[PDB]
Design a protein around this ligand. Sequence first.
Ligand SMILES: Cc1cc2nc3c(=O)[nH]c(=O)nc-3n(C[C@H](O)[C@H](O)[C@H](O)COP(=O)(O)OP(=O)(O)OC[C@H]3O[C@@H](n4cnc5c(N)ncnc54)[C@H](O)[C@@H]3O)c2cc1C
Ligand SMILES: Cc1cc2nc3c(=O)[nH]c(=O)nc-3n(C[C@H](O)[C@H](O)[C@H](O)COP(=O)(O)OP(=O)(O)OC[C@H]3O[C@@H](n4cnc5c(N)ncnc54)[C@H](O)[C@@H]3O)c2cc1C
Ligand SMILES: OC[C@@]1(O)OC[C@@H](O)[C@@H](O)[C@@H]1O
Ligand SMILES: [Cl-]
Ligand SMILES: [Cl-]
Ligand SMILES: [Cl-]
Ligand SMILES: [Cl-]
Ligand SMILES: [Cl-]
Ligand SMILES: [Cl-]
Ligand SMILES: [Cl-]
Ligand SMILES: [Cl-]
Lengths: 451, 451
Amino acid sequence: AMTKQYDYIVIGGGSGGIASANRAAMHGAKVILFEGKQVGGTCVNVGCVPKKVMWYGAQVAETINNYAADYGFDVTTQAFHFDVLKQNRQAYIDRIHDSYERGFDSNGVERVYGYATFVDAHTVEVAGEHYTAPHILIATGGHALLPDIPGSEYGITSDGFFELDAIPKRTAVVGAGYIAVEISGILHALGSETHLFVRRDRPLRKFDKEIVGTLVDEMKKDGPHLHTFSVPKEVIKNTDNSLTLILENGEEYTVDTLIWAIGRAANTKGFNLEVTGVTLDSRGFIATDAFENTNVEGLYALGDVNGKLELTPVAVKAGRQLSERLFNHKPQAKMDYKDVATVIFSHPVIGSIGLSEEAALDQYGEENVTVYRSTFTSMYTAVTSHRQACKMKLVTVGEDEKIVGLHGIGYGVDEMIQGFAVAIKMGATKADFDNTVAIHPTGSEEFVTMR
Amino acid sequence: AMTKQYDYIVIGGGSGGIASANRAAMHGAKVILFEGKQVGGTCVNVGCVPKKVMWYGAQVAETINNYAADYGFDVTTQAFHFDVLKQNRQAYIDRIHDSYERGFDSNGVERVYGYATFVDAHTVEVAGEHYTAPHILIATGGHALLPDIPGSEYGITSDGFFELDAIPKRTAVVGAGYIAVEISGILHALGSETHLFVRRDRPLRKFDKEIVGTLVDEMKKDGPHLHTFSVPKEVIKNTDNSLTLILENGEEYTVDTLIWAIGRAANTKGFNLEVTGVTLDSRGFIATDAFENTNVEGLYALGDVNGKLELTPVAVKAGRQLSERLFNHKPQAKMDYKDVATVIFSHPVIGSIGLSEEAALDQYGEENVTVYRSTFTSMYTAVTSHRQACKMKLVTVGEDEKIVGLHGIGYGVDEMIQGFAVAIKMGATKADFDNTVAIHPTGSEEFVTMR
Ligand SMILES: Cc1cc2nc3c(=O)[nH]c(=O)nc-3n(C[C@H](O)[C@H](O)[C@H](O)COP(=O)(O)OP(=O)(O)OC[C@H]3O[C@@H](n4cnc5c(N)ncnc54)[C@H](O)[C@@H]3O)c2cc1C
Ligand SMILES: Cc1cc2nc3c(=O)[nH]c(=O)nc-3n(C[C@H](O)[C@H](O)[C@H](O)COP(=O)(O)OP(=O)(O)OC[C@H]3O[C@@H](n4cnc5c(N)ncnc54)[C@H](O)[C@@H]3O)c2cc1C
Ligand SMILES: OC[C@@]1(O)OC[C@@H](O)[C@@H](O)[C@@H]1O
Ligand SMILES: [Cl-]
Ligand SMILES: [Cl-]
Ligand SMILES: [Cl-]
Ligand SMILES: [Cl-]
Ligand SMILES: [Cl-]
Ligand SMILES: [Cl-]
Ligand SMILES: [Cl-]
Ligand SMILES: [Cl-]
């Protein structure tokens, strides 16, 4: 069987691969995409989408349990059917799969649902057939890490969290990143006795400290039990099938399910990447330049596998810009990785753009940083017996007070950030914010009324 | 008793008057403020604040009644106690009152809770005493209009809506503006058989037609009963105390409560404004220049009474800018009334900045306008049996596609608009939006991923 020629081969049908394959096809490239598991990759199947559906479920629980009575509603929960939530979650995800397949047909992207293995730098094997192209994108994503301790195998990862068919009575979540925080918040809201174990002082250690302080204070009021300076030593499986987590400090916790959310690493093994000559960086990600080029001409890498910024919209935009470059004659087209906004679906949620106050002071010096901050109680919660704080801040630099960081935590913050991210990308200053008329009554107006 | 001398007299203790009085006092002016009713004016007592608390109660109802089951929560409502909601709403408002009084004391603003009547162009009478100043601000607000038909007196206005101590079993809401749409939306969510009557083909006629199309479709699915081409002829009070609304088309609707939300007019009567020589415009508002000057030196007018834009933050900023000009040596200080964002707390919410597609076409010409859109189902509702559309639109002009209009309708839109308002005030183009990385998964990202 002769080797099949293509203009572009995309390895991975996740956010990055789909985005790049579709854009290449829209510019006339003969493109083929390979996916060894399910279309949509991590975000659609075991990431952002199912996480957000579950977060909405947690919002519903909070409404019923914490706020309804104070708005006059005397309600009783006859039962909670996790299976109903999961079936509706999966039906939504299946519709997303269908949409991607309709998109490939429309754009003319060929795809084979099979695992791709390199034969040489410009050739891969899938289901026994060989395929070659002068352009090959490695968009293979990452995977969850497991600690190297006795009993590590008794824990599950975020993938296993989505495989659950019921809320465990008691759950341990180990980790200090956004995934650990999100999962632990959802589990607590949905009724699990939830314990969050962070290795050092607090979760989200690199985030703005003032904002994370409120996260910690609110979790204490309504959230998982937080255990600081908690370093896992071992996990024991007891006779009754429960798990006991043993920490280096000697403390022990018994739970039904234990979730490792300690980090993610690049998917670089199992597909004969070594024959390509592609170099990895010191953290194990595929090394790339500003244009997603590996060290080998005709091989590119983007999305989670390049380690730059593990977010769906980053993979999508980088993938689209690469295709603009390779197939639409734009040698300068590339991803802009600066001031990318994020939202962490904690409870309450955190929204962030740019530098923390700590990073700004480190970079610019205390004499050149001016911080504006507003702290209040979200109106939604203010009238109830479960009042919740909201903290917002603008980190500015220089005489013209250019906004280099914007952060908030509180009810509704998840939908506030995107617009401000446009303004920050345009170089907004405090004056630009002052020139904007507030929208009342909203939480978002507090960002433009600080003084 | 001689006439008391002041630097500044503010007639009205609402959003505009409070803001202007406080800022004038901060710059050393001897200021006195007069308020004939409650401190805080319309927004605090019978406007934005109580409206928003009620809207949150409606959102809780929607969660319980429409979405909870599909998230796996089988919930029953034993009772709805409107009194609980109202008491918490009033407590919140009372705290605002207290904070204003403390602020006046701190800032050095004198106030008398009495109605002010003009004696001459520079002198007012309050509780028998005379007061004079070379600067007098008329910030008297507006009032709800009542139709001139038999039985008009049986209806209440939005003030009466806040006086209600229970949700009426059946409610008629008459009008086509944001107040009618918001009130009818709240009444329906909270359980009233609600009928909304508009005089022409649709509500919110000045808003972008495609956005209103979604509003109408969603209202037909889940909202009040909408009656178009419906002009009130008379209201009959029946022997059982119900009210029958009779329309010019012959239809009759029997309800328990009827709310007139047909428009608001300036407060210009009853305080001897005629002796000042202040000119009114053809719509009955106090005419003013860009600096809030009336035609009479030493007399100013801002907030709802000047007719420019009926919004709290507008009244606040105009009042502050006026005090900057009069008392802080800033002759060019003034309000910027262009591209002021608004949110309408309809079901679902509408957010808007700038020109509708129709207005942009009229102004710039068809050859010079380009529109972008996103139409989807909000993820929150997508997994339920009450799926709700979300629609977003960018209206752009010229070769650079400057954004002159931004509009959205759907879940969470209320918190999305503020940040985009900053970007538009900075002169954002479609390229500036394209340059901004999306935040996923949110509704807000759909504003920056249109093609
Ligand atoms: C729990 C969780 C929550 C998250 N929440 C968010 C969020 O709220 N917002 C956000 O922006 N991001 C979020 N992320 C991150 C987001 O999911 C990733 O940044 C994104 O999926 C990366 O896209 P990608 O294309 O690089 O990789 P992936 O989507 O992981 O795609 C890689 C694909 O390649 C396939 N593959 C690998 N090797 C081969 C091979 N040899 N042959 C064929 N196929 C192969 C895999 O099967 C996989 O489907 C979350 C991640 C997790 C784990
Ligand atoms: C139902 C409703 C909902 C609303 N929702 C919103 C919203 O969501 N967002 C928004 O931005 N805006 C909203 N508004 C509009 C907002 O309330 C007004 O734009 C704002 O209150 C106007 O402020 P003002 O200072 O001009 O007038 P007001 O706040 O009305 O203050 C005028 C004051 O002057 C007093 N007064 C009048 N004459 C005299 C006199 N001779 N002597 C002494 N005192 C006098 C009155 O008692 C009154 O307190 C809403 C309005 C209504 C009615
Ligand atoms: O007004 C609250 C709200 O609209 O804020 C934005 C989103 O968080 C929504 O879930 C939420 O209902
Ligand atoms: Cl795509
Ligand atoms: Cl797992
Ligand atoms: Cl359960
Ligand atoms: Cl990681
Ligand atoms: Cl029309
Ligand atoms: Cl305008
Ligand atoms: Cl167009
Ligand atoms: Cl979403």
